[PDB]
Design an enzyme around this catalytic site. Structure first.
Site, PDB file in Angstrom:
ATOM      1  CD  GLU A  14      -2.806  -1.064   2.530  1.00 42.75           C
ATOM      2  OE1 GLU A  14      -2.230  -1.137   3.646  1.00 42.75           O
ATOM      3  OE2 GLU A  14      -4.045  -0.966   2.418  1.00 42.75           O
ATOM      4  NE  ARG A  48     -12.086  -6.446   4.018  1.00 39.05           N
ATOM      5  CZ  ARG A  48     -12.441  -6.981   2.852  1.00 39.05           C
ATOM      6  NH1 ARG A  48     -11.914  -8.137   2.456  1.00 39.05           N
ATOM      7  NH2 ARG A  48     -13.334  -6.363   2.082  1.00 39.05           N
ATOM      8  CD  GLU A 124     -21.096  -0.116   9.175  1.00 37.64           C
ATOM      9  OE1 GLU A 124     -20.547  -1.193   9.510  1.00 37.64           O
ATOM     10  OE2 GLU A 124     -21.818  -0.008   8.165  1.00 37.64           O
ATOM     11  CD  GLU A 128     -16.894  -3.196  10.934  1.00 34.54           C
ATOM     12  OE1 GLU A 128     -16.128  -2.495  11.616  1.00 34.54           O
ATOM     13  OE2 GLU A 128     -16.724  -3.420   9.716  1.00 34.54           O
ATOM     14  CG  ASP A 149      -3.986  -3.219  -3.231  1.00 33.97           C
ATOM     15  OD1 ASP A 149      -3.181  -3.741  -4.025  1.00 33.97           O
ATOM     16  OD2 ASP A 149      -4.441  -3.833  -2.236  1.00 33.97           O
ATOM     17  CD  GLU A 181     -18.575  -6.759   6.648  1.00 33.22           C
ATOM     18  OE1 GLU A 181     -17.480  -6.317   6.231  1.00 33.22           O
ATOM     19  OE2 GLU A 181     -19.506  -7.099   5.888  1.00 33.22           O
TER      20      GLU A 181
HETATM   21  C1  LIG Z   1     -11.215  -4.660  -1.473  1.00 36.41           C
HETATM   22  N1  LIG Z   1     -10.557  -3.696  -0.610  1.00 36.41           N
HETATM   23  C2  LIG Z   1     -11.221  -2.857   0.411  1.00 36.41           C
HETATM   24  N2  LIG Z   1     -10.188  -2.034   1.028  1.00 36.41           N
HETATM   25  C3  LIG Z   1     -10.340  -1.139   2.068  1.00 36.41           C
HETATM   26  O1  LIG Z   1     -11.446  -1.432   2.749  1.00 36.41           O
HETATM   27  C4  LIG Z   1     -12.279  -0.184   2.755  1.00 36.41           C
HETATM   28  C5  LIG Z   1     -13.611  -0.460   2.459  1.00 36.41           C
HETATM   29  O2  LIG Z   1     -13.641  -1.344   1.339  1.00 36.41           O
HETATM   30  P1  LIG Z   1     -14.824  -1.298   0.284  1.00 36.41           P
HETATM   31  O3  LIG Z   1     -14.356  -1.874  -1.052  1.00 36.41           O
HETATM   32  O4  LIG Z   1     -15.258   0.123   0.045  1.00 36.41           O
HETATM   33  O5  LIG Z   1     -16.025  -2.196   0.863  1.00 36.41           O
HETATM   34  P2  LIG Z   1     -15.738  -3.706   1.228  1.00 36.41           P
HETATM   35  O6  LIG Z   1     -15.054  -3.767   2.581  1.00 36.41           O
HETATM   36  O7  LIG Z   1     -17.035  -4.462   1.310  1.00 36.41           O
HETATM   37  O8  LIG Z   1     -14.864  -4.292   0.150  1.00 36.41           O
HETATM   38  C6  LIG Z   1     -11.645   0.700   1.579  1.00 36.41           C
HETATM   39  O9  LIG Z   1     -11.864   2.164   1.807  1.00 36.41           O
HETATM   40  C7  LIG Z   1     -10.438   0.439   1.637  1.00 36.41           C
HETATM   41  O10 LIG Z   1      -9.801   1.138   2.768  1.00 36.41           O
HETATM   42  C8  LIG Z   1      -8.973  -2.410   0.414  1.00 36.41           C
HETATM   43  N3  LIG Z   1      -7.656  -1.893   0.673  1.00 36.41           N
HETATM   44  C9  LIG Z   1      -6.545  -2.431  -0.067  1.00 36.41           C
HETATM   45  N4  LIG Z   1      -5.262  -1.940   0.187  1.00 36.41           N
HETATM   46  N5  LIG Z   1      -6.739  -3.420  -1.071  1.00 36.41           N
HETATM   47  C10 LIG Z   1      -8.020  -3.936  -1.335  1.00 36.41           C
HETATM   48  O11 LIG Z   1      -8.142  -4.790  -2.201  1.00 36.41           O
HETATM   49  C11 LIG Z   1      -9.186  -3.379  -0.563  1.00 36.41           C
HETATM   50 NA    NA Z   2       0.069  -4.754   5.642  1.00 37.68          NA
HETATM   51 NA    NA Z   3      -5.926   0.976   5.919  1.00 38.63          NA
END
Ligand SMILES: C[n+]1cn([C@@H]2O[C@H](COP(=O)(O)OP(=O)(O)O)[C@@H](O)[C@H]2O)c2nc(N)[nH]c(=O)c21
Ligand code: NA
Ligand code: NA
Ligand code: NA
Ligand code: NA
Ligand code: NA
Ligand code: NA
Ligand code: NA
Ligand code: NA
Ligand code: NA
EC number: 3.1.3.-
Length: 210
Positions: A14, A48, A124, A128, A149, A181
């Site tokens: 990252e 996560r 949230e 969570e 990413d 989650e």
């Molecule tokens: C899929 N994904 C989610 N995040 C982080 O998780 C937060 C929320 O992710 P989201 O994609 O908006 O919803 P989700 O959790 O259902 O996928 C984002 O603002 C990012 O901070 C992610 N952060 C990274 N570095 N790589 C990933 O593939 C990634």
């Molecule tokens: Na890391």
């Molecule tokens: Na982060």
């Protein structure tokens, strides 16, 4: 951190920019993160439930007879995820595994329609943590997080505030957590060797020491 310093951290996976801002935008689904400090003063972090890497891998499949995985991603997955990938093939062993891997994330989630920021954070946090986290006091400082990413070439935006919660570290550290989650809530200071530790620690320090 002052109202206009932007700080950019880099990890193997990252790049993240952290910048103090005055207000959170609110559009479609704004992402709001809670930097939680326990009653006994510990910073919290979530593991996560599903790793980013396994989420991505699953999203890349397109056949019932073919399964594709970049071996570079194997070191960024959980035990159960590795078991799922290799469950049918069952070769002797696999390489590039990190048995200490966890996907560290700040707790939080998406902003609902006409939902206040504080209500979103309370809701949230409750969802969570299986109803185990409540907020005593919110901090003043607002950070904007912009993350690239490096493995998937995607950029994410979120906003973070401090939440001083009613619970102790121990209150959240006897009973295992059953969320879709989150697989664990723990002290960030038990994570010193994590790729993300430096920038997460910076977020906490900026939120409480400014
Ligand atoms: C899929 N994904 C989610 N995040 C982080 O998780 C937060 C929320 O992710 P989201 O994609 O908006 O919803 P989700 O959790 O259902 O996928 C984002 O603002 C990012 O901070 C992610 N952060 C990274 N570095 N790589 C990933 O593939 C990634
Ligand atoms: Na890391
Ligand atoms: Na982060
Ligand atoms: Na957002
Ligand atoms: Na085997
Ligand atoms: Na291998
Ligand atoms: Na392993
Ligand atoms: Na890691
Ligand atoms: Na609670
Ligand atoms: Na409580």
């Amino acid at each position: 951190i002052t109202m206009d310093e932007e700080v950019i951290f880099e990890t193997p996976r990252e790049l993240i920019s952290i910048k103090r801002i005055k207000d959170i935008p609110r559009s479609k689904d704004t992402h709001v993160f809670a930097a939680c400090i326990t009653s006994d003063g510990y910073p919290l972090i979530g593991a996560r439930r599903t790793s980013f890497a396994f989420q991505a891998i699953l999203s890349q499949q397109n056949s019932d007879s073919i399964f594709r995985v970049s071996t570079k991603l194997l070191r960024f997955m959980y035990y159960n995820e590795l078991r799922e990938i290799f469950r049918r093939l069952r070769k002797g062993s696999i390489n590039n595994i990190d048995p200490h891997f966890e996907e560290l994330i700040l707790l939080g989630g998406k902003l609902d329609k006409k939902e206040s920021i504080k209500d979103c954070l309370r809701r949230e946090l409750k969802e969570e943590s299986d109803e185990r986290i409540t907020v005593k006091e919110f901090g003043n400082v607002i950070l904007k997080l912009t993350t690239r990413d490096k493995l998937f070439n995607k950029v994410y935006i979120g906003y973070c505030m401090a939440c001083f919660i009613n619970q102790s570290l121990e209150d959240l550290s006897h009973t295992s957590i059953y969320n879709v989650e989150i697989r664990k809530i723990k002290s960030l200071n038990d994570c010193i060797n994590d790729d993300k530790y430096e920038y997460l620690s910076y977020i906490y320090n900026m939120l409480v020491n400014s």
